[PDB]
Amino acid sequence: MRECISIHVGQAGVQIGNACWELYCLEHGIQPDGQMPSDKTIGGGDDSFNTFFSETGAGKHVPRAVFVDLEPTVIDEVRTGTYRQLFHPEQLITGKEDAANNYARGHYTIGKEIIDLVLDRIRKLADQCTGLQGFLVFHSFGGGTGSGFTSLLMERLSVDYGKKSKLEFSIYPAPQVSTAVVEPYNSILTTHTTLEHSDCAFMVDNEAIYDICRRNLDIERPTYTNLNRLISQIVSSITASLRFDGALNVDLTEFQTNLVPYPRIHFPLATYAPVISAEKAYHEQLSVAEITNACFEPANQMVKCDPRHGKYMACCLLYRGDVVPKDVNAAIATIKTKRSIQFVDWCPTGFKVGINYQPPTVVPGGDLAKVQRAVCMLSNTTAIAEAWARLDHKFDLMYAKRAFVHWYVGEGMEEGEFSEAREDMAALEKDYEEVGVD
Amino acid sequence: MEVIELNKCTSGQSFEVILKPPSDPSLEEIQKKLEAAEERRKYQEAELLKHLAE
Amino acid sequence: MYTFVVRDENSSVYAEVSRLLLATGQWKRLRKDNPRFNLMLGERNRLPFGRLGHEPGLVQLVNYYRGADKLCRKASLVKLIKTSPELSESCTWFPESYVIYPTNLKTDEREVFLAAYNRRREGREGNVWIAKSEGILISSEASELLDFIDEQGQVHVIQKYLEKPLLLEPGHRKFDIRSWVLVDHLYNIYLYREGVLRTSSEPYNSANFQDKTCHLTNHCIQKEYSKNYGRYEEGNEMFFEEFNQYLMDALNTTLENSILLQIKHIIRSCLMCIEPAISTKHLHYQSFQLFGFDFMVDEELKVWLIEVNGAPACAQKLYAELCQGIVDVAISSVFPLATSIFIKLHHHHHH
Amino acid sequence: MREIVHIQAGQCGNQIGAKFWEVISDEHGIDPTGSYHGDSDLQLERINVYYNEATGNKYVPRAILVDLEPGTMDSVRSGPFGQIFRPDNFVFGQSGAGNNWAKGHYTEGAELVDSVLDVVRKESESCDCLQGFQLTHSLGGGTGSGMGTLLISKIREEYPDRIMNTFSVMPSPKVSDTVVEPYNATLSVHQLVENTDETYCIDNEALYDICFRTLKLTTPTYGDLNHLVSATMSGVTTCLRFPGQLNADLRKLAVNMVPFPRLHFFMPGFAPLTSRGSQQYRALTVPELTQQMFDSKNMMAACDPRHGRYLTVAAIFRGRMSMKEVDEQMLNVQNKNSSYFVEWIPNNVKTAVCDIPPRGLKMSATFIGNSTAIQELFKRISEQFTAMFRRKAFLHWYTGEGMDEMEFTEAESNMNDLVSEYQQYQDA
């Protein structure tokens, strides 16, 4: 058994961590006070849920989590909400004044005064680990904290814990819920300074989650609560193999080995089916074939792109519920006949498959219905580079006029870092095009 | 179309199906970057207060 | 008021589509790089499909199908026909063709080309081929072809020259047929009922191959190297009533039985093959596209597909009608306002 | 980023500031003695932004009241909400400033400003995290204009890393106390361009016309003008006063609204327009709110938005209503008028909704545009300036207090530069 530390940074990061830790406790049968009646090794152990929870002498199971925000209100709602008892105070770090949607304010100005406090509260958790795998980092591209502070944190994690793997769950900016005009700036900036420090990143475009909510949850105008319970479902699919007995993605190194053959192209697409409204009166439950087929609809992806005009480098199918290999192979066989799936010439055309027999857990009184079987597909397709195209375009449009740049320079950044980051992104876009177009 | 490396346990099973074979910077470089930005900040603030002093 | 943008100004077709769109008073053109458009009439190369379908409150539509270049580049089309089981190397309406790269570069089926040509060497069959990729050449011995291929820079196809073409009289000359296909956002395949015969004006001469005016029927070429251009038909362009009347009077058929059945079959087989790779049925933006299918009729009244064009121009007199047709069935079907000129190609045989 | 410090200076500054505190105390359920008597606790969640907490759980406006003469401040003290203000935060001289920027900035105002700064520091030291300052004043008299820009210079000296926010009433001949008003405005605009982060340009011309043309008041008073201003100020600060996602503090608002440091002069607007008596009873529908709030005749700065282009827009909807409907409506106004929004700032219209409506209305919409059409305002001032300045008329009132013509020439130059900088982006 080897422990994973989750770090949630900013509003988006903290609120998503809230959702995921709620979910995790439901799935592992841990209750709000932190007691786990099913754990009979009292006071410790090396079961695989211990990967995410530590144990205390009193029977309390404590997330290996740190929440960091530069302003107090959101982490205050953690400190005071239904899982108040779950977390130890030293795991919740607030500032007094936030980063005002300014990458440079979060990275340089305010990051510097709190980076050391954060690294010490992290070291405190690492010191309770017999073998630490590395880190799961939750944050948004768009916020000032979530973008700027995260990148500072990642630089210093690579120095302080250099042999450890680091994974991101990154929230990509969408105008339907975005809070700032400079969110493309922040995104490019933090992608550029975090690229070499992160081994695998799962992007989630708020536009895709938003429309999944509208279209398949019958939600008229989704809130962050709607968005976040869906996102946590997907996150739990992605992490269930660290938290449960199995032989696929049992550690963080395996995610890179299985989904990332080239280190910079480390952005796997996540597709998830089925998303079914809890207020659906009559629902015919879906087959292995139907949900695996849904995995290849763009409408089910965390980022809206078209994988038909790209190439695959890797594809994992994580099933949860009642699934057996023969149905999966039947489904794959017929899907390949009817669909445009082409891998790169230097990679097997195959699917690594993982099945956990426990169906997806859904939050009581949520939007999601219970189902008999569900799948999360993780596919490293070059088509995700569409999302960079979009972002880079917006960036160019503003930076051509240096609009808003002065807010960054006034925090101590230098105009030129804007274009070093933009040129790194140009390198990135062309890496994708080399690998996946002819 | 071959199923390979199949593993089973009470809680699940995992396998691979193949359809077709293949056809950093240092601690103080960082406190350098951060202190260069802080000094840029303090220079701009000082030019502001020299202008206000005039 | 719907809003649209124009990023191909060298487009004869969509220029008139812009004009007709504006003169509705329900469409307003915006400037080339403004995001908040309903419809993009896009550039040819490097059209940014990645940026389409992401402006909330705007159903977006574009006059190109991402990935349809597979059908509209010569090498891509040869590869698509050979590799895809629905068409196959057994295909009866495509000429025997092979993809050849210059050895300046180094996949390529040159070794496979000469085996077929050698059994036709050996079998006293006609064995003239065309090399294509303005840069074409027709010849009976292979060496000519391959070394021509390589003193250019880029990738070519080598295709059986149709040695016995149907020849219109008076003239004893060649022709090709161009059909205008329009695929809407739902993947209805509309054939435009007016095609055109791009004719030659010089009698077809089987002996001296290098004189390319009797052999190549491009509107370009016969307006430049041809003595009689404009003698028989205006602009070397015969339309479907005259061609039908000729088939009736001279050969006892009609155009629909002798030729059009096959053309509709080829169009629908070609597009229904690529449908799962380019369909925009469940996508966040939607495509339509105007294609130009180019056919050759041999002397036995059997049709062969020559090439597919992704950005075709219309023959002058037909612009008005076809362009209106693009507005009614491709554009206004997505964006409603306050006798039809297409055959919808559909066929569900049971087996 | 919580506490704001409020300063109101001069006759106009203090009359509108008094109306502002009446309006927002009523919204936050606070009575003229500072006792809280409310229903929803959305009223108190961010009330410390504008109020300090006192001994009998009473609420004191974080408000400093400044004048060079005591008339208007005396009337505020006896006004309906007068006793709610901290009595030591009233700071005033006796001289008056005689509609004279130079007395405000250099002579009479210099005497008083140090005591104003003492009270300002006493308020700042109590703040757990100060956001910055908002000043209300006119730019056409002397105390508000001259001393208010003096105060802004001192405050930026003592707190260079806090946001400076102003509501600045521009002068119009249509509503005009003295002929030297363009002089006072030009001088003041020169300070505002350099020393504030966000300025709401409240044009007395536009307030007059809204009272006259659409509200059908024949002879509008400063009371009728301040009604409009109180409601607009409420609306442009609602995102700061209630729990909220968007433009929720002075700095994030600045980051969202100000793409270039000098171009921070905002055009505010309000819908529906109310005459203080008529009490009109019709339901306003979301498409109606959205079409009105964007219409020139609902805008407090007398400019034609179609003569320019929006760099940024902040919209705020107040009332119980469909956020699906407002999202749809906002996208339809931008998608059907995309010409008027710069294409090189993507998604520059940001929109907020708050449950509590203002008093008297079930539904309301406040608009804050950083339009380049605002140049029109400044151009008008500069014409009125030059007409006098080219004969150096009325200058003695200023040169007698030590000023030189060259200061006037610099101020004129800098305003004409500001308008050229606005027009640089209107053609791009």
Ligand SMILES: Nc1nc2c(ncn2[C@@H]2O[C@H](COP(=O)(O)OP(=O)(O)OP(=O)(O)O)[C@@H](O)[C@H]2O)c(=O)[nH]1
């Ligand atoms: N999906 C999702 N997105 C969120 C959530 N909260 C904020 N966002 C998005 O994140 C971006 C804003 O970033 P935030 O995380 O709120 O900002 P921050 O990291 O706290 O940085 P500062 O507030 O500037 O200190 C916008 O795109 C929002 O749409 C959330 O809870 N869920």
Ligand SMILES: Nc1ncnc2c1ncn2[C@@H]1O[C@H](COP(=O)(O)OP(=O)(O)CP(=O)(O)O)[C@@H](O)[C@H]1O
């Ligand atoms: N296999 C073949 N056999 C006989 N003739 C052929 C032939 N292929 C092409 N041709 C002749 O060459 C001409 C077609 O050239 P090509 O197919 O390359 O079109 P193109 O790309 O030059 C211009 P456009 O797009 O307007 O048709 C036809 O008119 C035909 O007469």
Ligand SMILES: Nc1nc2c(ncn2[C@@H]2O[C@H](COP(=O)(O)OP(=O)(O)O)[C@@H](O)[C@H]2O)c(=O)[nH]1
């Ligand atoms: N909107 C509005 N404008 C006012 C009011 N009182 C004065 N003004 C305007 O302010 C200018 C005069 O400035 P004023 O505040 O009276 O002088 P000060 O006390 O020395 O700053 C003139 O342009 C008046 O139109 C008011 O109550 N409301």
Ligand SMILES: [Ca+2]
């Ligand atoms: Ca245990």
Ligand SMILES: [Ca+2]
């Ligand atoms: Ca590393």
Ligand SMILES: [Ca+2]
């Ligand atoms: Ca004195």
Ligand SMILES: [Cl-]
């Ligand atoms: Cl290490």
Ligand SMILES: [Mg+2]
């Ligand atoms: Mg925050």
Ligand SMILES: [Mg+2]
């Ligand atoms: Mg062609």
Ligand SMILES: [Mg+2]
């Ligand atoms: Mg003193």
Ligand SMILES: [Mg+2]
């Ligand atoms: Mg006065």
